Scaffold this active site. Structure first.
Site, mmCIF file in Angstrom:
data_model
loop_
_atom_site.group_PDB
_atom_site.id
_atom_site.type_symbol
_atom_site.label_atom_id
_atom_site.label_comp_id
_atom_site.label_asym_id
_atom_site.label_seq_id
_atom_site.Cartn_x
_atom_site.Cartn_y
_atom_site.Cartn_z
ATOM 1 C CG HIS A 158 3.107 7.403 0.155
ATOM 2 N ND1 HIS A 158 2.531 8.703 0.131
ATOM 3 C CD2 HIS A 158 2.359 6.676 0.990
ATOM 4 C CE1 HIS A 158 1.533 8.720 1.006
ATOM 5 N NE2 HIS A 158 1.439 7.491 1.537
ATOM 6 C CE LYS A 176 -4.084 9.579 0.869
ATOM 7 N NZ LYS A 176 -2.804 8.824 0.812
ATOM 8 C CG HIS A 214 1.220 5.374 8.078
ATOM 9 N ND1 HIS A 214 0.030 4.778 7.600
ATOM 10 C CD2 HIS A 214 0.821 6.504 8.708
ATOM 11 C CE1 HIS A 214 -0.987 5.548 7.878
ATOM 12 N NE2 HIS A 214 -0.536 6.613 8.563
ATOM 13 C CG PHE A 215 4.700 9.862 3.218
ATOM 14 C CD1 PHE A 215 5.934 9.633 2.641
ATOM 15 C CD2 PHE A 215 4.334 11.160 3.523
ATOM 16 C CE1 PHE A 215 6.729 10.701 2.254
ATOM 17 C CE2 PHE A 215 5.145 12.223 3.167
ATOM 18 C CZ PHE A 215 6.359 11.985 2.566
ATOM 19 C CG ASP A 216 4.631 10.446 10.800
ATOM 20 O OD1 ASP A 216 3.557 9.886 11.097
ATOM 21 O OD2 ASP A 216 5.225 11.191 11.547
ATOM 22 C CE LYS A 255 -3.768 2.006 2.813
ATOM 23 N NZ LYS A 255 -5.017 1.634 3.524
ATOM 24 N NE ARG A 273 -2.399 20.511 0.928
ATOM 25 C CZ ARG A 273 -2.649 20.254 2.203
ATOM 26 N NH1 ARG A 273 -3.842 20.496 2.743
ATOM 27 N NH2 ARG A 273 -1.677 19.744 2.937
HETATM 28 CL CL CL Z 1 -0.105 1.289 10.370
HETATM 29 N N NH3 Z 2 0.953 6.284 4.236
HETATM 30 PT PT PT Z 3 -0.064 3.198 8.844
HETATM 31 PT PT PT Z 4 -0.206 6.988 2.541
HETATM 32 PT PT PT Z 5 -1.515 8.551 8.389
#
Ligand code: CL
Ligand code: NH3
Ligand code: PT
Ligand code: PT
Ligand code: PT
Ligand code: NH3
Ligand code: NH3
Ligand code: PT
Ligand code: PT
Ligand code: PT
Length: 119
Positions: A12, A36, A114-116, A7, A80
């Site tokens: 990303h 999104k 996960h992209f923080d 994912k 965006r």
């Molecule tokens: Cl997660």
């Molecule tokens: N993400």
């Molecule tokens: Pt995540």
């Molecule tokens: Pt993401």
């Molecule tokens: Pt997130």
């Protein structure tokens, strides 16, 4: 049945114009049911992004400590949604920058899930 690691690559990674985000948000299935609103693509090799999991350890936004900051700046595209964008006619502004990325890493192999943030 998509893994967290898969994912992250779909949302990303772009390891490959003004309309980039319009085209990319579509082809990555991020306009399917809703638009999104915000998403970042990393314009680097998968190997270079996976290497972030061995760089600077930092807290994640959510308070976990499995986040990492890239030592180097990376080529990123911020997508965006415009003020006037309405599903299913999703419209994005495309912005290119060179920034550090922060990712959460998990699993074996220990890779981004996960992209923080970008900084
Ligand atoms: Cl997660
Ligand atoms: N993400
Ligand atoms: Pt995540
Ligand atoms: Pt993401
Ligand atoms: Pt997130
Ligand atoms: N940097
Ligand atoms: N980019
Ligand atoms: Pt690029
Ligand atoms: Pt690129
Ligand atoms: Pt820097």
């Amino acid at each position: 049945k998509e893994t967290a690691a898969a994912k992250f690559e779909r949302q990303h990674m772009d390891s490959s114009s003004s309309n980039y985000c319009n085209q990319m948000m579509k082809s990555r299935n991020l306009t399917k049911d809703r638009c999104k609103p915000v998403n970042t693509f990393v314009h680097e090799s998968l190997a270079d992004v996976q290497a972030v999991c061995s760089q600077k350890n930092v807290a994640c936004k959510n308070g976990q400590t499995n986040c990492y900051q890239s030592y180097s700046t990376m080529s990123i595209t911020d997508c965006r949604e415009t003020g006037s964008s309405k599903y299913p006619n999703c419209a994005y502004k495309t912005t290119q920058a060179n920034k550090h990325i922060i990712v959460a890493c998990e699993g074996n192999p220990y890779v981004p899930v996960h992209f923080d943030a970008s900084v």
